[PDB]
Amino acid sequence: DWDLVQTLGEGAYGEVQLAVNRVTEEAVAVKIVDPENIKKEICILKMLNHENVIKFYGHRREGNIQYLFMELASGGSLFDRIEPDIGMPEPDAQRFFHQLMAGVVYLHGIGITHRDIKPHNLLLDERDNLKIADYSLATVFRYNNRERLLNKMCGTLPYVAPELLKRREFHAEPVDVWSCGIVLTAMLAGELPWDQPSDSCQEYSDWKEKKTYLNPWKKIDSAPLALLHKILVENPSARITIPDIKKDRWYNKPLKK
Numbered sequence: 112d113w114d115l116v117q118t119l120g121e122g123a124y125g126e127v128q129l130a131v132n133r134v135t136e137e138a139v140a141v142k143i144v145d146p147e148n149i150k151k152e153i154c155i156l157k158m159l160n161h162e163n164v165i166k167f168y169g170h171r172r173e174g175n176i177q178y179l180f181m182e183l184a185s186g187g188s189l190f191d192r193i194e195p196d197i198g199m200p201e202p203d204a205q206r207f208f209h210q211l212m213a214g215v216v217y218l219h220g221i222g223i224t225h226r227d228i229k230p231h232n233l234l235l236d237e238r239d240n241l242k243i244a245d246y247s248l249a250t251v252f253r254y255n256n257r258e259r260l261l262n263k264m265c266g267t268l269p270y271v272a273p274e275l276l277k278r279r280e281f282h283a284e285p286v287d288v289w290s291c292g293i294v295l296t297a298m299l300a301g302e303l304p305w306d307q308p309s310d311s312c313q314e315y316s317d318w319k320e321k322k323t324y325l326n327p328w329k330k331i332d333s334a335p336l337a338l339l340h341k342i343l344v345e346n347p348s349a350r351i352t353i354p355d356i357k358k359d360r361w362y363n364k365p366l367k368k
């Protein structure tokens with residue numbers, strides 16, 4: 112059995128605890144759940160094989176409760192590397208963004224959308240490699256080479272793409288690209304640009320009107336800001352795709368550790 116030493120946090124659907132093995136002292140992260148939902152999460156977790164996606168060990172159920180076993184991320188979360196109102200050194204932000212894109216390209220290539228990318232769900236191993244965690248909202252958007260549109264609102268309001276608040280159905284990939292742009296903003300400014308990307312929200316209107324002399328944008332060097340101008344495009348069909356992010360000037364800029 113296992114000893115639950117502390118809560119690491121709450122996911123989109125449940126709890127996550129630091130569990131220490133009573134016989135081994137091996138420290139792991141365990142998600143303990145009370146349905147159709149967890150059946151789906153486990154199945155997605157089983158598909159995952161990438162250096163920038165969290166390691167799933169396996170699962171155990173006992174009546175009113177089911178247990179999900181994951182690689183403990185010894186570096187904790189990206190959230191804890193963001194200094195409020197400051198962010199982090201631009202070279203650490205670019206490296207983490209390179210790794211986030213590697214993880215998202217992997218997921219999209221196996222037809223999976225994460226749907227809740229934010230710094231809380233991005234963990235760091237002992238060598239500060241980024242791992243995309245929390246598959247509680249993840250779903251299939253491509254099967255047998257056929258795309259299906261999403262038609263369900265979920266995620267986290269400051270990270271969600273505007274089409275998810277406006278369209279009955281929308282493409283999965285541009286939504287995950289948007290959330291990656293808000294994560295890049297967070298890493299470079301230590302502040303979220305808006306509560307939600309709605310015309311009711313003045314900070315979002317100011318961005319559409321290009322007032323980049325306001326915060327958080329004025330904290331952001333012109334090169335990464337140019338990338339953010341192509342990611343945070345309201346119309347998903349005009350938003351930059353990952354293959355063109357890989358071509359961006361800042362994305363390809365050599366920066367010093």
Ligand SMILES: Cc1nn(C)cc1Nc1nc(N)c2c(C#N)c(N3CCC[C@H]3C)n(C)c2n1
Binds near residue numbers: 120121123
């Ligand atoms: C060693 C360590 N110190 N601290 C403060 C955090 C860790 N390491 C760690 N390792 C994980 N494996 C997860 C994990 C998952 N899975 C998780 N989460 C919280 C709820 C959302 C989810 C991403 N969190 C927060 C995780 N934290």
Ligand SMILES: [Cl-]
Binds near residue numbers: 190230301
């Ligand atoms: Cl933040």
Ligand SMILES: [Cl-]
């Ligand atoms: Cl090309």
